[PDB]
Amino acid sequence: RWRQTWSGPGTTKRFPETVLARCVKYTEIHPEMRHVDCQSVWDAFKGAFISKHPCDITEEDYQPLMKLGTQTVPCNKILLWSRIKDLAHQFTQVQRDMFTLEDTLLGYLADDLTWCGEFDTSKINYQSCPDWRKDCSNNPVSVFWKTVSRRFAEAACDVVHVMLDGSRSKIFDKDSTFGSVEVHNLQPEKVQTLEAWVIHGGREDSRDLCQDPTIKELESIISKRNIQFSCKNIYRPDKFLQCVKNPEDSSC
């Protein structure tokens, strides 16, 4: 075919193999997840979207996968991110100072992948998948991130951190998943502070991007959930990672 059904990229080539090698790899490394049967995980994942219309996925469809990938992560060491994941991941790999959702099993399975099924068939669609915007929001990928991120946010306690993309015009964006899901699922009974780290892009002598209007809007949205706000600029993410690695007082 010269024209696809849907507007978005199709299921990642070799998706089921990748998911599968991900899981085996994850649960070999993480002793907490050793009880996990990776074939069961894949079957639960498949079951969420195979033979289902890819615009009528619900969070219930993912319940079996959520149940199998139940994981306790230290609730006080959660790193959220919005838009800017590569630094967040590079940071957590330095000495596990925190945990991003991609450091949980479910997150690690799905990072960077796309996937969908078709209604009248029980195959996987490698040709095209729904775009959240042009097509429908209730698709397999969006509903997955929504359901798993809601649960991750609800488990956070104490000081939760979030890395933001200070090179955007909207450093905090209400309409991102962080802005629309995670932030409204931080629990007032558990979360003491949300501290944002605003990662600069451009050269040298930047503003204190912590006084940005959208950052003020974030502060005020979370206050009005009874959670304190703190914010830090990361002016040079290069030297930040380097200080994280070699905190040795280079000038860190």
DSSP 70-131: -----GGGBEEESS-HHHHHHHHHHH-SSB-GGGSHHHHHHTT----B-TT-SSB-SS-B--
Active-site residue, selected from the candidate residues 157, 210, 243, 252: 157
Domain boundaries, the chain: 1-72+100-155, 73-99+156-252
Alpha carbons 52 and 45: distance in angstroms, whole number: 13
Backbone angles phi, psi at 197, to 5 degrees: -120, 115
Q: Exposure pattern of 53-63 as b/e (b: 16+ CB <10 Å)?
A: bbeebebebbe
The reply to whether 1-72+100-155 and 73-99+156-252 are identical in fold is no
Alpha carbons 226 and 229: distance in angstroms, whole number: 10
Q: Which amino acid is at 171?
A: I
Kindly state the tokens that stand for 72: 């306790």
- Tokens 């860190």 belong to residue: 252
Asked if residue 152 lies in contact with residue 185, where contact means CB atoms within 8 angstroms, the answer is no
- Tokens 């502060």 belong to residue: 219
In the residue annotation, 157 being an active-site residue is answered as yes
Domain 1-72+100-155, architecture per CATH: Up-down Bundle (1.20)
Provide the 3-class DSSP secondary structure of residue 53.
coil
Q: Which residues contact 195 (CB under 8 A, 6 or more apart)?
A: 159, 160, 161, 162, 229, 230, 231, 232
Residues 57/100/175/118 CA torsion (nearest 10 deg): -20
Q: How many CA atoms lie within 13 A of 177 on its CB side?
A: 21
Alpha carbons 50 and 140: distance in angstroms, whole number: 9
Active-site residue, selected from the candidate residues 75, 116, 136, 243: 75
Alpha carbons 211 and 197: distance in angstroms, whole number: 12
Asked if residue 147 lies in contact with residue 48, where contact means CB atoms within 8 angstroms, the answer is no
Q: How far is CA 141 from CA 97, 113, 128, in A?
A: 28, 8, 13
Kindly state the tokens that stand for 111: 């990072």
- Surface-to-core class of residue 16, CB atoms within 10 Å of its CB (0-12 exposed, 13-18 middle, 19+ buried): middle
Q: What technique determined this structure?
A: X-ray
- The closest of 8, 67, 62, 2 to 36, measured between CA atoms, is 67
Q: Which amino acid is at 172?
A: F
Helices within 155-236 (DSSP H only): 177-180, 213-223
Q: How far is CA 194 from CA 160, 166, 180, in A?
A: 5, 17, 15
Q: What is the CATH number of domain 73-99+156-252?
A: 3.40.50.720
In the residue annotation, 116 being an active-site residue is answered as no
